[PDB]
C-alpha cells in the first residue's frame, strides 16, 4: 500500500545539510557504486540478496544455523588465491561489519587497546583523542 | 500547567483529537466508499 496523504519535503532546518558526496536520490536500477562503503554495500546486498537484514553478526550466524567464520573464509580463500586464511576471515568479518553493526568481541577490544597504546599521546592541545579513547575504554568494563 | 498564571482547560483541542478540527486522510477512498454505499 501507499501513504495516507502526500506532502512536499520538509524545509531544511538552520545548520542542517545533506552529508557531502551522499547521493540522496539513488534508485535500485542505478549502477553499482565502485567504492566499498557502508551505504554502497548495503544497497548491493539489498539488490542481490533480497531484503534480508540482521542487526548483528550473531543474528546472521543464528539464521545460517551453525556456520562460523572459518567455514566461509575457506570459500573466500578458494575464490581469491592471494588472500590467505587470515585475510579471508578478515574479509568475511569486514563484509559482515559493513553490512550490519560491528561485532563486540574480546579480540576486538584487545586490538583497540593495543592500537591505542601504540599511538600513545597526540598533538591535540587538550589531548582530545586521548580523552575520547579513555572514555571509550572506560565505558566497556 | 498554567501559562501566564492561568491553567490550560483543555489540551486535546490543540492536538485536534476528538474535535472539529481533525485531519483529513485517505479522502479519495472515503469518498469512494461513501459513493458506493450511497
Amino acid at each position: 500500500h501507499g501513504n495516507l496523504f502526500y506532502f512536499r519535503e520538509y524545509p531544511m532546518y538552520p545548520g542542517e545539510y545533506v552529508p557531502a558526496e551522499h547521493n540522496t536520490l539513488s534508485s535500485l536500477r542505478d549502477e553499482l557504486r565502485l567504492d566499498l562503503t557502508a551505504q554502497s554495500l548495503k544497497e548491493a546486498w539489498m539488490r542481490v540478496s533480497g531484503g534480508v537484514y540482521f542487526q548483528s553478526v550473531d543474528e546472521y550466524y543464528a539464521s545460517v544455523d551453525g556456520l562460523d567464520a572459518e567455514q566461509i573464509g575457506e570459500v573466500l580463500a578458494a575464490l581469491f588465491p592471494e588472500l590467505n586464511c587470515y585475510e579471508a576471515q578478515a574479509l568475511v568479518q569486514r563484509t559482515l561489519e559493513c553490512i550490519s553493526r560491528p561485532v563486540s568481541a574480546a579480540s576486538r577490544q584487545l586490538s583497540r587497546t593495543i592500537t591505542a597504546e601504540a599511538v600513545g599521546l597526540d598533538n591535540a592541545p587538550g589531548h582530545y583523542t586521548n580523552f575520547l579513547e579513555w572514555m571509550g575504554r572506560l565505558t566497556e568494563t | 500547567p498554567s501559562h501566564s498564571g492561568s491553567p490550560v482547560f483543555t489540551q486535546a483541542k490543540l492536538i485536534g483529537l476528538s474535535g472539529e478540527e481533525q485531519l483529513t486522510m485517505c479522502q479519495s477512498e472515503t469518498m469512494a466508499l461513501r459513493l458506493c454505499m450511497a
Binding site: 545539510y17 552529508p19 557502508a38 563486540s104 571509550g136 575504554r137 | -
Partner: protein, 100 residues
C-alpha cells in the same frame, strides 16, 4: 620632502582582524546559525520571560559542537558511525526562526 627615502622601505602594518577572524575556531559550525532570542526581564510582577511565547529558556536543539560525539562515544569507538547520517547532518540543527 624628506619622506622620499623613507617611502622606499614602505613597511606597513599587517592585517590582524582578518587573521583573528580566519584562524581556526574551536566552536565552528559548517552552516552559521542565528542565535535564538534570549528571555528578558519583562517586569517586577512578570519576571523573566521571552517575548515570543513567554518561554523561560532560550530555544535550542544543540548548543555544543561535541554533544553528539559525547552521546555516541561508544559507537564512535566501535566505528559504527563511520558513515552515519543522523549525527553527521543533525549535529548542529537548530529550531526554525518562528516569529513575525
Amino acid at each position: 620632502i624628506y619622506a622620499h627615502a623613507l617611502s622606499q622601505f614602505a613597511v606597513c602594518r599587517q592585517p590582524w582582524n582578518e587573521y583573528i577572524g580566519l584562524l581556526t575556531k574551536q566552536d565552528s559550525t559548517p552552516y552559521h546559525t542565528e542565535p535564538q532570542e534570549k528571555p528578558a526581564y519583562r517586569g517586577r510582577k512578570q519576571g523573566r520571560e521571552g517575548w515570543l511565547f513567554g518561554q523561560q529558556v532560550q530555544l535550542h536543539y544543540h548548543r555544543f559542537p561535541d554533544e553528539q560525539l559525547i552521546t555516541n562515544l561508544s559507537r564512535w569507538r566501535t566505528g559504527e558511525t563511520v558513515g552515519d547520517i543522523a549525527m553527521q547532518q543533525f549535529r548542529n540543527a537548530q529550531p526554525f526562526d518562528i516569529e513575525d
